Design an enzyme around this catalytic site. Structure first.
Site, PDB file in Angstrom:
ATOM      1  N   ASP B  29       0.900  -1.134   0.000  1.00 31.47           N
ATOM      2  CA  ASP B  29       0.000   0.000   0.000  1.00 31.47           C
ATOM      3  C   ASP B  29       0.948   1.195   0.000  1.00 31.47           C
ATOM      4  OD1 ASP B  29      -1.517   2.264   0.963  1.00 31.47           O
ATOM      5  OD2 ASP B  29      -3.071   0.824   1.551  1.00 31.47           O
ATOM      6  N   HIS B  98     -10.545  -6.011   0.032  1.00 30.42           N
ATOM      7  CA  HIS B  98      -9.111  -6.047   0.282  1.00 30.42           C
ATOM      8  C   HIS B  98      -8.793  -6.224   1.764  1.00 30.42           C
ATOM      9  CE1 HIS B  98     -10.669  -2.176   0.969  1.00 30.42           C
ATOM     10  NE2 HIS B  98      -9.585  -1.442   0.795  1.00 30.42           N
TER      11      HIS B  98
END
Ligand code: MG
Ligand code: ZN
Ligand code: ZN
Lengths: 141, 139
Positions: B29, B98
């Protein structure tokens, strides 16, 4: 076995059950961060997420979506989170794997995620080196 | 679709790939709330945890413990969390299921959980009613 969850699975300690099958057991967290706060745990005593095998992961995760939808339909929250803590400093107080299913209603929620970004501290090549390193260890998975 | 994650899966948008198989793709991320911060997602597009089917669930979850262990051995953190957000009000910024795998190192961690207990707000009978109500749909 000084595990509070194993005693709940063994019935030695009462619980507010919401779901149960051969390998999974779900029940309300008495802390009730929010109305409907549920704990989904496997009956097998697995300390943390690391001890999960594929076979055990299969007998566990499917229940999460089912339970989540059930809670969403019953109380129609505006949101919902799932949280798993591994390690004392990560927020894990009981050393038996458990997933928190937290419905969200807005103002008053006993749960909230502090989110501090750090994107400007990493360049595209650093990210590539980091991911590349984790990936290498995963070639054997 | 108009899903940014589906575009990453397709290869249109670049990403720092951590894991990939038949039905799962995991990548860092860019927010990196902590070093090693990783997003694990199903290649098949689903908006949230509610759209999971048993088969997709079977082909998805097994990757989380594998990725968790890899991040464990690589960075030797003192902890680790997994977080899923469903709904804008729950923190969901990208509408494609996710799982956030967040290693914890302590001082400096960009992630932390606000925990407010309300146990004295419910009686033993109330927990039974709340649980039973939920269990009714699960059958
Ligand atoms: Mg390896
Ligand atoms: Zn236990
Ligand atoms: Zn998508």
């Amino acid at each position: 076995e000084n595990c509070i969850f194993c005693k709940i699975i063994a019935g030695d300690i009462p619980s507010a059950k919401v779901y149960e099958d051969e390998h999974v057991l779900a029940f309300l967290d008495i802390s009730q961060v929010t109305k409907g706060h549920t704990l989904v745990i496997p009956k097998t005593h697995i300390e943390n997420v690391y001890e999960f095998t594929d076979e055990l992961a299969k007998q566990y995760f499917h229940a999460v979506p089912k339970i989540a939808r059930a809670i969403r339909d019953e109380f129609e929250p505006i949101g919902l989170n799932t949280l798993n803590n591994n390690g004392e400093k990560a927020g894990q107080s009981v050393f038996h794997y458990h997933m928190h299913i937290i419905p969200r209603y807005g103002k008053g929620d006993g749960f909230g995620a502090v989110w501090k970004t750090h994107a400007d501290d990493y360049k595209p090549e650093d990210l590539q080196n980091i991911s590349s390193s984790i990936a290498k260890r995963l070639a054997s998975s």
